[PDB]
Each structure stands twice: as C-alpha cells, then as structure tokens.
Amino acid sequence: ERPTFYRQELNKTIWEVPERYQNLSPVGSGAYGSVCAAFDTKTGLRVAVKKLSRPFQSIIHAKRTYRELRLLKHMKHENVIGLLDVFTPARSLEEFNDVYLVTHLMGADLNNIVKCQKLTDDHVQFLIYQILRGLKYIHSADIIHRDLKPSNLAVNEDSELKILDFGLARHTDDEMTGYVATRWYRAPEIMLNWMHYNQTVDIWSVGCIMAELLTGRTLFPGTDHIDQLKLILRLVGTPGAELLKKISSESARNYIQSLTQMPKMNFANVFIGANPLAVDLLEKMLVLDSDKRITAAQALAHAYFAQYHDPDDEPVADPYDQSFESRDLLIDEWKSLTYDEVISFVPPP
Ligand SMILES: O=C1CCc2c(-c3ccc(F)cc3F)cc(C3CCNCC3)cc2N1c1c(Cl)cccc1Cl
C-alpha cells in the first residue's frame, strides 16, 4: 500500500514525500535546516517533517538513527513529541538510505515565548504542569531526557506544550563551553560528571526552567562550568558529607571539598513576590543531592498544580526496551534494524 511520492527541492536538497503532504516549507537554518512545516491533507493537521540525511554514513550515525526512531515510535503522550508518520521513498532495504519523521507542528519553543520576560503565575503553572506530565510519562518508560531546556520545549499559540529531543543529547565539549544556554539547565552531577546520573537530572532542569518563567531571568547563567557550579552552590549550598560520598569521581569530590562551605539560601528572598507554593516546589526540585529531589509523579500532586492536577489523566508509558544501547553491531545491522522499524510503523488512530 505504498503511497505515491513526489520530489521537491528544499534547502538545497531533494525532499521526496507522499502526496498527502503538501505546502512543504523550510522552518529554519542550523539544526532547523532538515525540518519543514507542511499540511497533512489526510489528517488535516499542520505537521513538521524532519529528514535524516545519510543516516547510515557510519556505525555511530547508523545507531543514532536507530535510536531516534525507536524513541519517537515509543512516545504516545500529549506532552511528548511522537510520530504521526515515518517513511522512506525506498522500495527495498538495498535502496533504503533516507528517513523522514512526521510529527505535530507546534511552531515555537518556550524561548520565543518567554525570553527576557516574566510570565504570570497561572501561565507558569500550566507550562510546568505539562512539562511534568510528559516527564512523568517519559520517566515511567525508564527513559531519561537528559538535556531539557526551553529550546527543546515546543509550544503553540494556545501554550500547549510537547517535549522533544529526549534521550538524544550527545553534545560536544565545545558546545557546552562558556556562556551558553546549552549548559545552564544541566544538573551539576551531570555537568561535572560526579556520578552515574539518572532521571533525577531532568527534575533539576525543570526547576531551572520554572525559575526562569517566574523571574524572566536565567537561574544559573554561568560563564563556564566552574562559574556555573559556583552560582549553583551559592543558591543551594555546598555539598554535605552524605552527598560527598556519593560523588564517585575522586577528582570531582576533591575539587568540591576545596570550596568554602556555604549554606542554602532562603528561596523566599531569592524569588521575591512569587507564589509561596511555587517557591516550595522550587526548593524541592533544586536539591543538590539528586536522590532527594522530588520526582515528576510527586510534583504533579504538589498543591501548586491544584488547578490542573488530575490523577486519572496523567498516564504512564509502556516499558521501553533499550537493550540495543549496549549492543555493538555493524552499519548494515543497524540499518536493517532501522528499516524494520520504518516498515512496521502503525499510524496512530
Ligand atoms: O513544532 C515543532 C515540533 C517538531 C520539531 C522537531 C522534530 C522532532 C522530531 C521529529 F520526528 C520531527 C521534528 F520535526 C525538531 C525541532 C528542532 C528544535 C530543537 N533542535 C533540534 C531541531 C523543532 C520542531 N518544532 C518547531 C518548528 Cl517545526 C518550528 C519552530 C519551533 C519549533 Cl519547536
């Protein structure tokens, strides 16, 4: 039941997609250069189509392509970017060499919606509520986003939000260097590789985001890794004995201990004028020891979200098999696994 595809030049490249998708138009430069907005005449939805080009140029890239497709095919939640469609114009494994991923078009990220601006409390409640609802879902499948920030939070004009780019974070040292937003939302244990981190790193990121929505200012705009750690410890206090032991990196632990001790600050005096419940929640998300941070599920039941919380409408995910991550395969093997996933795709109802 192969649909009919048509060709078209976009961003100096040839896009070949099923007829149902019309009015393709590039959305931007940079990482936005492989994405086009379109109208899906079959569903009547405005969609976004990302073309993965030469997804099998290397072992590493072939595995990345498989990883992204597996992740996107697994997500079926209102606050998480998922797949409306995935296709290839190829008629056989032999010819298979391009992957196209179709999802909802939100049209903007949280920055474009808040950069340098303080939001009303109700608006912050709604936005953080959705981030946590989708994060609850993501974590329930044992998936860690690990690189949550405003630029990876897609929002439409009705302020509805979908989390994207989860479990794909593979930044370069250079990209994390200096005065850059790419590192401002990262939990300290991951920024400085203190220990084997887990999903709790994502809660730290939500706290950073929430504070920014409330004040209109970056919470920890470090000029570098060290300056940022300093900004963090000034607010949340230097590690206690118990946490120091959990820092398996003897190198990191040793540096940490060289710092003059500091007590956690009073958040009510940092976030002056903010809803006391929002302040309480920030204190529970921005805890240095990741073991003690509130979880997405717990945060959803926090009073700050009374107006939105509904325990019967905050679903969890089916289990996500990521055994492939520890597997070393050849390019063709990773390519063949990707092909099976493409052809076995079942459209959402
Ligand atoms: O609305 C969406 C959802 C689809 C999407 C994707 C996307 C993810 C998975 C998929 F299968 C298809 C997609 F189109 C990627 C990015 C970029 C933003 C973050 N950096 C990487 C790419 C932006 C967007 N956008 C988007 C678009 Cl298309 C334009 C402006 C802002 C945003 Cl957030």
152 and 53 both lie in a single domain? no
Expressed in angstroms and rounded, the spacing between residue 48 Cα and the centre of ligand 1 is 7
98: CATH: 3.30.200.20
Count the Cβ atoms, other than its own, within 10 Å of residue 171.
13
Tokens standing for residue 340: 């099976």
Number of domains in the chain: 2
- CA gap 301, 282 in Å, rounded: 14
Same domain, yes or no: 340 and 230: no
Helical packing angle, 200-215 and 121-140, nearest 10°: 170
Which of 154, 155, 136, 158 has its CA nearest to residue 145?
136
C-alpha–C-alpha distance, residues 220 and 148, integer Å: 14
**215 and 119 both lie in a single domain:** yes
Q: State the CB neighbour count (10 A cutoff) for residue 8.
A: 13
Residues 121 and 244 in one domain: yes
- CATH of residue 201: 1.10.510.10
Q: Are residues 163 and 27 in the same domain?
A: no
Terminus-to-terminus CA distance in the chain, angstroms? 18
Pocket test for ligand 1, best of 164, 170, 341 (most atoms within 8 A of CB): 164
Mark whether 141 and 220 lie in a shared domain: yes
Q: Residue 210 — left, alpha, or beta (φ > 0 → left; ψ -120 to 50 → alpha)? A: alpha
| CB 323, CB 77: distance < 8 Å | no
| 238 and 340 co-located in one domain | no
Rounded to an integer, what is the distance from CA 255 to the centroid of its chain? 30
Residue nearest to atom 16 of ligand 1 (CA): 32
Query: Same structural domain for residues 187 and 296?
Result: yes
Range of the domain at 117: 108-316
Distance CA 240, CA 226 (A): 19
Distant-in-sequence, close-in-space partners of 197: CB < 8 Å, separation ≥ 6: 144, 146, 187, 189, 190, 290
Is 30 annotated as ligand-binding?
A: yes
- Catalytic residue numbers? 165
Write out the two tokens for 65: 């392509």
**For this experimental structure, what is the resolution in angstroms?**
2.1
d(CA 280, CA 118): 19
227 and 339 together in one domain:
no
Q: How far apart are CA 100 and CA 72, in angstroms?
A: 12
CA distance 303 to 221: 29
Q: CA 164, CA 75: separation in Å to the nearest integer?
A: 10
Residues 239 and 247 sit within 8 Å (Cβ to Cβ)? yes
Coil, helix or strand for 13? strand
Ligand 1 midpoint to CA 323 (Å)? 27
* DSSP annotation of 313: S
Distances from the Cα of 115 to the Cαs of 96, 109, 118, 305, in angstroms? 41, 10, 8, 23
Q: Which atom of ligand 1 is nearest to 72's Cα?
A: 11
Q: Where are the alpha helices (DSSP H) in the chain?
A: 59-74, 110-114, 121-140, 181-184, 188-191, 200-215, 225-236, 241-246, 250-257, 267-270, 276-285, 296-300, 331-343
Same domain, 144 and 30: no
Residue nearest to atom 19 of ligand 1 (CA): 152
Residue/partner pairs of 290-293 with CB below 8 Å, 24 or more apart: 290/187, 290/189, 290/197, 290/198, 290/200, 290/201, 290/204, 291/200, 291/246, 293/200, 293/203, 293/204
Q: Clarify whether residues 38 and 114 are in a common domain.
A: no
Q: Token pair for residue 240?
A: 């206690």
